[PDB]
Amino acid sequence: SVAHGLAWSYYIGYLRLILPELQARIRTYNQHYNGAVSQRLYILLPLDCGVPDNLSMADPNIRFLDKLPQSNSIYELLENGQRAGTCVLEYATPLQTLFAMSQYSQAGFSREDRLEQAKLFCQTLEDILADAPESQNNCRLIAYQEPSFSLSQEVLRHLR
Amino acid sequence: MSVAHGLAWSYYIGYLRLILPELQARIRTYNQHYVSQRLYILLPLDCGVPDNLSMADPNIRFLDKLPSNSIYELLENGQRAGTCVLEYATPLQTLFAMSQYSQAGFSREDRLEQAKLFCQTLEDILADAPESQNNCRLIAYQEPFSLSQEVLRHLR
Ligand SMILES: CC(C)(C)c1ccc(N2C(=O)c3ccccc3[C@H](C(=O)O)[C@H]2c2ccc3c(c2)OCCO3)cc1Cl
Ligand SMILES: CC(C)(C)c1ccc(N2C(=O)c3ccccc3[C@H](C(=O)O)[C@H]2c2ccc3c(c2)OCCO3)cc1Cl
Protein backbone atom coordinates (compact mmCIF):
# COMPACT_ATOMS: atom_id res chain seq x y z
CA SER A 1 0.00 0.00 0.00
CA VAL A 2 1.91 3.09 -1.36
CA ALA A 3 -0.44 5.44 0.58
CA HIS A 4 1.21 4.75 3.98
CA GLY A 5 4.59 5.98 2.72
CA LEU A 6 3.08 8.96 0.87
CA ALA A 7 1.08 10.15 3.95
CA TRP A 8 4.06 9.78 6.33
CA SER A 9 6.41 11.69 3.97
CA TYR A 10 3.79 14.45 3.41
CA TYR A 11 3.49 14.99 7.18
CA ILE A 12 7.14 14.38 8.35
CA GLY A 13 8.77 16.29 5.49
CA TYR A 14 6.37 19.20 5.10
CA LEU A 15 3.20 19.66 7.28
CA ARG A 16 5.10 19.02 10.56
CA LEU A 17 7.46 21.89 9.57
CA ILE A 18 5.00 24.53 8.16
CA LEU A 19 1.85 24.08 10.36
CA PRO A 20 3.40 25.16 13.77
CA GLU A 21 4.50 28.50 12.18
CA LEU A 22 1.43 29.13 9.93
CA GLN A 23 -0.65 30.92 12.61
CA ALA A 24 2.08 33.55 13.11
CA ARG A 25 2.51 33.99 9.31
CA ILE A 26 -1.25 34.57 8.79
CA ARG A 27 -1.36 36.91 11.82
CA THR A 28 1.57 38.90 10.37
CA TYR A 29 -0.10 39.17 6.91
CA ASN A 30 -3.40 40.30 8.54
CA GLN A 31 -1.56 42.95 10.63
CA HIS A 32 0.28 44.13 7.47
CA TYR A 33 -2.95 44.64 5.48
CA ASN A 34 -6.18 46.30 6.65
CA GLY A 35 -10.14 41.84 4.57
CA ALA A 36 -8.66 38.93 6.55
CA VAL A 37 -7.14 35.50 5.83
CA SER A 38 -8.58 32.51 7.82
CA GLN A 39 -6.07 30.95 10.30
CA ARG A 40 -5.65 27.40 8.79
CA LEU A 41 -4.18 25.63 5.71
CA TYR A 42 -6.93 24.07 3.65
CA ILE A 43 -5.58 21.02 1.83
CA LEU A 44 -7.38 19.86 -1.31
CA LEU A 45 -7.53 16.08 -1.59
CA PRO A 46 -9.16 15.23 -4.96
CA LEU A 47 -9.77 11.46 -4.70
CA ASP A 48 -9.21 11.31 -8.54
CA CYS A 49 -5.54 12.40 -7.85
CA GLY A 50 -5.74 15.16 -10.50
CA VAL A 51 -3.49 18.07 -9.50
CA PRO A 52 -3.46 20.98 -12.00
CA ASP A 53 -0.45 23.28 -12.72
CA ASN A 54 -2.27 26.26 -11.13
CA LEU A 55 -5.10 25.90 -8.57
CA SER A 56 -6.98 28.84 -10.24
CA MET A 57 -7.47 26.65 -13.38
CA ALA A 58 -9.82 24.24 -11.47
CA ASP A 59 -12.56 26.93 -10.84
CA PRO A 60 -13.02 30.58 -12.07
CA ASN A 61 -14.47 31.40 -8.61
CA ILE A 62 -10.98 30.79 -6.99
CA ARG A 63 -8.82 33.88 -7.67
CA PHE A 64 -5.15 34.11 -6.66
CA LEU A 65 -4.84 36.91 -4.08
CA ASP A 66 -1.25 36.80 -2.81
CA LYS A 67 1.60 34.59 -1.52
CA LEU A 68 1.85 34.10 2.25
CA PRO A 69 5.38 35.33 3.12
CA GLN A 70 8.24 33.25 4.68
CA SER A 71 5.58 29.01 -0.57
CA ASN A 72 1.85 29.09 0.27
CA SER A 73 -0.94 30.94 -1.62
CA ILE A 74 -3.95 32.95 -0.45
CA TYR A 75 -7.13 32.81 -2.58
CA GLU A 76 -10.45 34.61 -2.61
CA LEU A 77 -13.43 32.29 -3.01
CA LEU A 78 -16.36 33.75 -4.98
CA GLU A 79 -20.07 33.03 -4.79
CA ASN A 80 -22.27 34.89 -7.32
CA GLY A 81 -19.44 37.36 -8.09
CA GLN A 82 -18.97 38.41 -4.44
CA ARG A 83 -15.98 37.57 -2.17
CA ALA A 84 -17.35 34.72 0.02
CA GLY A 85 -14.02 33.81 1.69
CA THR A 86 -10.22 34.22 1.88
CA CYS A 87 -7.89 31.34 2.83
CA VAL A 88 -4.51 29.65 2.36
CA LEU A 89 -5.27 26.79 -0.03
CA GLU A 90 -3.21 24.09 -1.79
CA TYR A 91 -3.38 20.50 -3.08
CA ALA A 92 -2.02 17.43 -1.27
CA THR A 93 0.84 17.13 -3.87
CA PRO A 94 1.80 13.45 -2.97
CA LEU A 95 -1.47 12.45 -4.75
CA GLN A 96 0.52 13.06 -8.03
CA THR A 97 2.45 9.81 -7.34
CA LEU A 98 -0.82 7.85 -7.39
CA PHE A 99 -1.99 9.55 -10.62
CA ALA A 100 1.39 8.98 -12.34
CA MET A 101 1.37 5.32 -11.15
CA SER A 102 -2.08 4.86 -12.70
CA GLN A 103 -0.67 6.01 -16.13
CA TYR A 104 2.60 3.92 -15.92
CA SER A 105 1.61 0.56 -17.48
CA GLN A 106 4.36 -1.59 -15.76
CA ALA A 107 3.09 -0.67 -12.26
CA GLY A 108 -0.13 -2.69 -12.86
CA PHE A 109 -1.96 -0.01 -10.83
CA SER A 110 -5.58 0.55 -12.03
CA ARG A 111 -7.92 3.56 -11.51
CA GLU A 112 -9.80 1.34 -8.96
CA ASP A 113 -6.45 0.72 -7.11
CA ARG A 114 -5.73 4.50 -7.36
CA LEU A 115 -9.03 5.42 -5.70
CA GLU A 116 -8.35 2.85 -2.88
CA GLN A 117 -4.92 4.41 -2.23
CA ALA A 118 -6.24 8.02 -2.43
CA LYS A 119 -8.77 7.12 0.30
CA LEU A 120 -6.09 5.29 2.37
CA PHE A 121 -3.79 8.38 2.05
CA CYS A 122 -6.56 10.61 3.48
CA GLN A 123 -7.33 8.12 6.33
CA THR A 124 -3.63 7.61 7.22
CA LEU A 125 -3.08 11.41 7.15
CA GLU A 126 -6.03 12.02 9.51
CA ASP A 127 -4.63 9.24 11.84
CA ILE A 128 -1.26 11.08 11.81
CA LEU A 129 -2.90 14.48 12.43
CA ALA A 130 -4.93 13.04 15.34
CA ASP A 131 -1.61 12.59 17.27
CA ALA A 132 -0.15 15.99 16.24
CA PRO A 133 -2.15 18.71 18.15
CA GLU A 134 -0.51 21.90 16.69
CA SER A 135 -0.86 20.32 13.18
CA GLN A 136 -4.55 19.14 13.39
CA ASN A 137 -5.62 22.59 14.63
CA ASN A 138 -3.61 24.40 11.89
CA CYS A 139 -4.94 22.42 8.86
CA ARG A 140 -8.23 21.19 7.32
CA LEU A 141 -8.44 18.34 4.82
CA ILE A 142 -10.99 18.68 2.03
CA ALA A 143 -11.45 15.23 0.43
CA TYR A 144 -13.76 15.08 -2.59
CA GLN A 145 -14.97 12.96 -5.47
CA GLU A 146 -16.32 14.74 -8.57
CA PRO A 147 -19.85 13.56 -9.58
CA SER A 148 -21.72 19.86 -12.49
CA PHE A 149 -19.01 20.38 -9.75
CA SER A 150 -17.90 23.56 -7.98
CA LEU A 151 -14.61 23.38 -6.09
CA SER A 152 -15.14 26.87 -4.58
CA GLN A 153 -18.46 25.64 -3.13
CA GLU A 154 -16.78 22.54 -1.63
CA VAL A 155 -14.12 24.75 0.04
CA LEU A 156 -16.69 27.34 1.24
CA ARG A 157 -18.72 24.59 2.97
CA HIS A 158 -15.66 23.62 5.06
CA LEU A 159 -14.84 27.30 5.86
CA ARG A 160 -18.30 27.69 7.47
CA MET B 1 2.05 -0.91 7.03
CA SER B 2 5.46 -0.30 5.46
CA VAL B 3 6.38 3.27 4.39
CA ALA B 4 9.19 2.11 2.06
CA HIS B 5 6.84 0.97 -0.76
CA GLY B 6 5.36 4.48 -1.07
CA LEU B 7 8.78 6.19 -0.75
CA ALA B 8 10.36 4.01 -3.51
CA TRP B 9 7.41 4.44 -5.92
CA SER B 10 7.35 8.23 -5.45
CA TYR B 11 11.17 8.50 -5.85
CA TYR B 12 10.96 6.66 -9.18
CA ILE B 13 7.65 7.97 -10.67
CA GLY B 14 8.14 11.60 -9.58
CA TYR B 15 11.86 12.00 -10.25
CA LEU B 16 14.07 9.13 -11.65
CA ARG B 17 11.57 8.25 -14.42
CA LEU B 18 11.81 11.92 -15.58
CA ILE B 19 15.61 12.61 -15.30
CA LEU B 20 17.18 9.19 -16.25
CA PRO B 21 15.98 9.06 -19.96
CA GLU B 22 17.66 12.46 -20.60
CA LEU B 23 20.81 12.01 -18.40
CA GLN B 24 22.95 10.30 -21.08
CA ALA B 25 22.49 13.26 -23.47
CA ARG B 26 23.28 15.76 -20.65
CA ILE B 27 26.55 14.00 -19.71
CA ARG B 28 27.55 13.67 -23.42
CA THR B 29 26.82 17.41 -23.91
CA TYR B 30 28.97 18.36 -20.86
CA ASN B 31 31.81 16.08 -22.07
CA GLN B 32 31.66 17.63 -25.58
CA HIS B 33 31.68 21.14 -24.01
CA TYR B 34 34.87 20.44 -21.98
CA VAL B 35 32.61 11.98 -17.41
CA SER B 36 30.79 8.57 -16.50
CA GLN B 37 27.38 8.03 -18.15
CA ARG B 38 25.30 7.04 -15.03
CA LEU B 39 23.65 8.63 -11.95
CA TYR B 40 25.14 7.16 -8.80
CA ILE B 41 22.61 7.20 -5.97
CA LEU B 42 23.89 7.00 -2.40
CA LEU B 43 21.69 4.88 -0.17
CA PRO B 44 23.07 5.10 3.40
CA LEU B 45 21.08 2.40 5.26
CA ASP B 46 21.38 4.63 8.42
CA CYS B 47 19.20 7.26 6.54
CA GLY B 48 21.66 10.07 7.33
CA VAL B 49 21.60 12.67 4.54
CA PRO B 50 23.96 15.64 5.12
CA ASP B 51 23.33 19.25 3.94
CA ASN B 52 26.27 19.03 1.48
CA LEU B 53 27.50 15.74 -0.04
CA SER B 54 31.17 16.95 0.26
CA MET B 55 30.88 17.02 4.11
CA ALA B 56 30.68 13.16 4.24
CA ASP B 57 34.27 12.77 2.74
CA PRO B 58 37.16 15.20 1.92
CA ASN B 59 38.01 12.88 -1.06
CA ILE B 60 34.66 13.87 -2.73
CA ARG B 61 35.12 17.37 -4.18
CA PHE B 62 32.42 19.37 -6.02
CA LEU B 63 33.36 19.89 -9.64
CA ASP B 64 30.33 21.46 -11.35
CA LYS B 65 26.53 21.26 -11.84
CA LEU B 66 25.27 19.16 -14.76
CA PRO B 67 23.20 21.61 -16.84
CA SER B 68 19.88 20.04 -10.61
CA ASN B 69 22.52 17.27 -10.51
CA SER B 70 26.11 17.62 -9.24
CA ILE B 71 29.40 16.33 -10.70
CA TYR B 72 32.14 15.30 -8.23
CA GLU B 73 35.75 14.28 -8.45
CA LEU B 74 36.61 11.28 -6.30
CA LEU B 75 40.15 11.29 -4.84
CA GLU B 76 42.38 8.41 -3.83
CA ASN B 77 45.74 9.39 -2.28
CA GLY B 78 45.39 12.99 -3.57
CA GLN B 79 44.93 11.92 -7.22
CA ARG B 80 41.68 12.20 -9.27
CA ALA B 81 40.37 8.60 -9.27
CA GLY B 82 36.97 9.34 -10.85
CA THR B 83 34.35 11.87 -12.00
CA CYS B 84 30.61 11.16 -11.72
CA VAL B 85 27.12 12.54 -11.10
CA LEU B 86 26.41 11.67 -7.50
CA GLU B 87 23.54 12.34 -5.07
CA TYR B 88 21.70 10.84 -2.09
CA ALA B 89 18.36 8.99 -2.28
CA THR B 90 16.58 11.97 -0.58
CA PRO B 91 13.37 9.97 0.40
CA LEU B 92 15.57 8.28 3.08
CA GLN B 93 15.14 11.59 5.05
CA THR B 94 11.50 10.58 5.75
CA LEU B 95 12.70 7.41 7.49
CA PHE B 96 15.32 9.33 9.54
CA ALA B 97 12.79 12.03 10.55
CA MET B 98 10.24 9.29 11.44
CA SER B 99 12.82 7.64 13.70
CA GLN B 100 13.17 11.00 15.65
CA TYR B 101 9.36 11.69 15.87
CA SER B 102 8.13 10.07 19.13
CA GLN B 103 4.43 9.59 18.11
CA ALA B 104 5.35 7.46 15.07
CA GLY B 105 6.63 4.63 17.36
CA PHE B 106 9.26 3.96 14.65
CA SER B 107 12.54 2.59 16.13
CA ARG B 108 16.08 2.60 14.62
CA GLU B 109 15.57 -1.20 14.07
CA ASP B 110 12.31 -0.40 12.14
CA ARG B 111 14.22 2.35 10.25
CA LEU B 112 16.94 -0.06 9.08
CA GLU B 113 14.22 -2.57 7.94
CA GLN B 114 12.50 0.15 5.87
CA ALA B 115 15.80 1.51 4.44
CA LYS B 116 16.56 -2.04 3.17
CA LEU B 117 12.99 -2.45 1.84
CA PHE B 118 13.29 0.92 0.01
CA CYS B 119 16.48 -0.29 -1.81
CA GLN B 120 14.94 -3.69 -2.64
CA THR B 121 11.64 -2.14 -3.90
CA LEU B 122 13.55 0.50 -5.91
CA GLU B 123 15.74 -2.19 -7.52
CA ASP B 124 12.50 -4.15 -8.39
CA ILE B 125 11.07 -0.97 -9.97
CA LEU B 126 14.31 -0.24 -11.91
CA ALA B 127 14.36 -3.86 -13.19
CA ASP B 128 11.16 -3.13 -15.20
CA ALA B 129 12.34 0.29 -16.47
CA PRO B 130 15.06 -0.40 -19.13
CA GLU B 131 16.21 3.19 -19.96
CA SER B 132 16.19 3.95 -16.19
CA GLN B 133 18.22 0.91 -14.92
CA ASN B 134 20.92 1.37 -17.59
CA ASN B 135 21.35 5.08 -16.58
CA CYS B 136 21.50 4.67 -12.75
CA ARG B 137 23.50 2.78 -10.07
CA LEU B 138 22.42 2.30 -6.45
CA ILE B 139 25.13 2.33 -3.81
CA ALA B 140 23.66 0.87 -0.60
CA TYR B 141 25.92 0.88 2.46
CA GLN B 142 26.05 0.45 6.23
CA GLU B 143 28.74 2.40 8.15
CA PRO B 144 30.72 0.19 10.60
CA PHE B 145 34.71 4.18 6.67
CA SER B 146 35.50 5.62 3.26
CA LEU B 147 32.53 6.84 1.20
CA SER B 148 34.80 7.76 -1.75
CA GLN B 149 36.19 4.15 -1.72
CA GLU B 150 32.67 2.70 -1.66
CA VAL B 151 31.74 4.84 -4.72
CA LEU B 152 35.04 4.10 -6.52
CA ARG B 153 34.44 0.34 -6.20
CA HIS B 154 31.09 0.67 -8.02
CA LEU B 155 32.61 2.93 -10.74
CA ARG B 156 35.10 0.15 -11.63
C1 LIG C 1 5.73 14.27 -12.27
C2 LIG C 1 4.70 15.04 -11.43
C3 LIG C 1 3.29 14.61 -11.86
C4 LIG C 1 4.85 16.51 -11.85
C5 LIG C 1 4.97 14.82 -9.92
C6 LIG C 1 5.21 15.91 -9.09
C7 LIG C 1 5.48 15.77 -7.75
C8 LIG C 1 5.51 14.51 -7.17
N1 LIG C 1 5.84 14.35 -5.77
C9 LIG C 1 5.13 13.49 -4.96
O1 LIG C 1 4.19 12.84 -5.37
C10 LIG C 1 5.58 13.40 -3.55
C11 LIG C 1 5.25 12.28 -2.79
C12 LIG C 1 5.68 12.17 -1.48
C13 LIG C 1 6.44 13.18 -0.92
C14 LIG C 1 6.77 14.30 -1.66
C15 LIG C 1 6.35 14.42 -2.98
C16 LIG C 1 6.69 15.62 -3.83
C17 LIG C 1 5.54 16.63 -3.80
O2 LIG C 1 4.53 16.41 -3.17
O3 LIG C 1 5.74 17.72 -4.49
C18 LIG C 1 6.98 15.16 -5.28
C19 LIG C 1 8.32 14.45 -5.39
C20 LIG C 1 8.42 13.10 -5.74
C21 LIG C 1 9.65 12.47 -5.81
C22 LIG C 1 10.80 13.18 -5.54
C23 LIG C 1 10.72 14.54 -5.21
C24 LIG C 1 9.49 15.16 -5.13
O4 LIG C 1 11.83 15.30 -4.95
C25 LIG C 1 13.07 14.73 -5.41
C26 LIG C 1 13.15 13.24 -5.08
O5 LIG C 1 12.00 12.52 -5.61
C27 LIG C 1 5.26 13.39 -7.96
C28 LIG C 1 4.99 13.56 -9.31
CL1 LIG C 1 4.67 12.11 -10.20
C1 LIG D 1 12.91 17.84 6.77
C2 LIG D 1 13.98 17.17 5.90
C3 LIG D 1 14.87 16.28 6.80
C4 LIG D 1 14.88 18.31 5.39
C5 LIG D 1 13.32 16.40 4.72
C6 LIG D 1 13.65 16.74 3.41
C7 LIG D 1 13.07 16.11 2.32
C8 LIG D 1 12.13 15.12 2.51
N1 LIG D 1 11.49 14.49 1.38
C9 LIG D 1 11.32 13.13 1.31
O1 LIG D 1 11.71 12.38 2.19
C10 LIG D 1 10.63 12.62 0.09
C11 LIG D 1 10.02 11.36 0.12
C12 LIG D 1 9.38 10.88 -1.00
C13 LIG D 1 9.33 11.63 -2.16
C14 LIG D 1 9.93 12.88 -2.20
C15 LIG D 1 10.58 13.39 -1.08
C16 LIG D 1 11.24 14.74 -1.07
C17 LIG D 1 12.73 14.60 -1.39
O2 LIG D 1 13.22 13.51 -1.58
O3 LIG D 1 13.40 15.71 -1.44
C18 LIG D 1 11.03 15.41 0.30
C19 LIG D 1 9.60 15.89 0.49
C20 LIG D 1 8.76 15.34 1.45
C21 LIG D 1 7.45 15.77 1.59
C22 LIG D 1 6.97 16.77 0.78
C23 LIG D 1 7.81 17.36 -0.19
C24 LIG D 1 9.11 16.91 -0.33
O4 LIG D 1 7.39 18.37 -1.00
C25 LIG D 1 6.22 19.07 -0.53
C26 LIG D 1 5.14 18.07 -0.06
O5 LIG D 1 5.66 17.16 0.94
C27 LIG D 1 11.78 14.74 3.81
C28 LIG D 1 12.37 15.37 4.89
CL1 LIG D 1 11.89 14.82 6.46
Residue numbers in the entry:
A (entry chain A): 154 to 187, 192 to 227, 241 to 317, 322 to 334
B (entry chain B): 153 to 186, 194 to 226, 241 to 317, 323 to 334
Task: Provide the authors' original text about this structure.
STING is broadly implicated in various diseases, including cancer, autoimmune disorders, neurodegeneration, and rare monogenic diseases. In this work, we use an orthosteric STING activator and inhibitor from the same chemical series to discover that STING M271 is a critical residue for molecular activation. The M271CH3 NMR chemical shifts reveal a unique molecular signature for pharmacological or genetically driven activation and inhibition that is not able to be resolved by other biophysical methods. We show hydrophobic interaction in this region plays an important role in regulating STING activity.
Since orthosteric STING inhibition is poorly understood, we compared the STING bound between diABZI-i and THIQi, the only other orthosteric, chemically distinct STING inhibitor reported to date. Our findings show no significant differences in lid formation between these two structures, substantiating that beta sheet lid organization over the binding pocket is not required for orthosteric STING activation or inhibition. All apical wing distances calculated in this study are bookended by cGAMP-STING ( ~39 Å) and cdG-STING ( ~56 Å), indicating that apical wing shortening or lengthening is not predictive for STING activation. Both orthosteric STING inhibitors used in this study adopt similar splayed open conformations, suggesting an open conformation could be required for inhibition. THIQi (inhibitor) and ABZI (agonist)-bound STING155-341 led to the highest quality spectra and therefore were used for 1H-15N HSQC and 1H-13C HSQC resonance assignments (see “Methods” section for detailed description of backbone and sidechain assignments). Approximately 88% of the backbone amides and 85% of the methyls were assigned for THIQi-bound STING155-341, while 84% of the backbone amides and 60% of the methyls were assigned for ABZI-bound STING155-341. In the inactive state (i.e. apo and THIQi-bound STING), M271S forms sulfur-aromatic interactions with W161 and F279. M271CH3 sits directly in between the aromatic rings of W161 and F279, which leads to a large shielding effect caused by the aromatic ring current and consequent upfield shift. M271CH3 chemical shifts of THIQi-bound STING155-341 and THIQi-bound STING V155M155-341 remain in the upfield region in both spectra, indicating both STING155-341 and STING155-341 V155M adopt the inactive conformation in the presence of inhibitor. THIQi demonstrates partial rescue of the elevated IFN in this model (IC50 = 13 ± 4 μM, % inhibition = 54% ± 26%) with an inhibition potency within three-fold of the WT THP-1 cGAMP stimulation model.
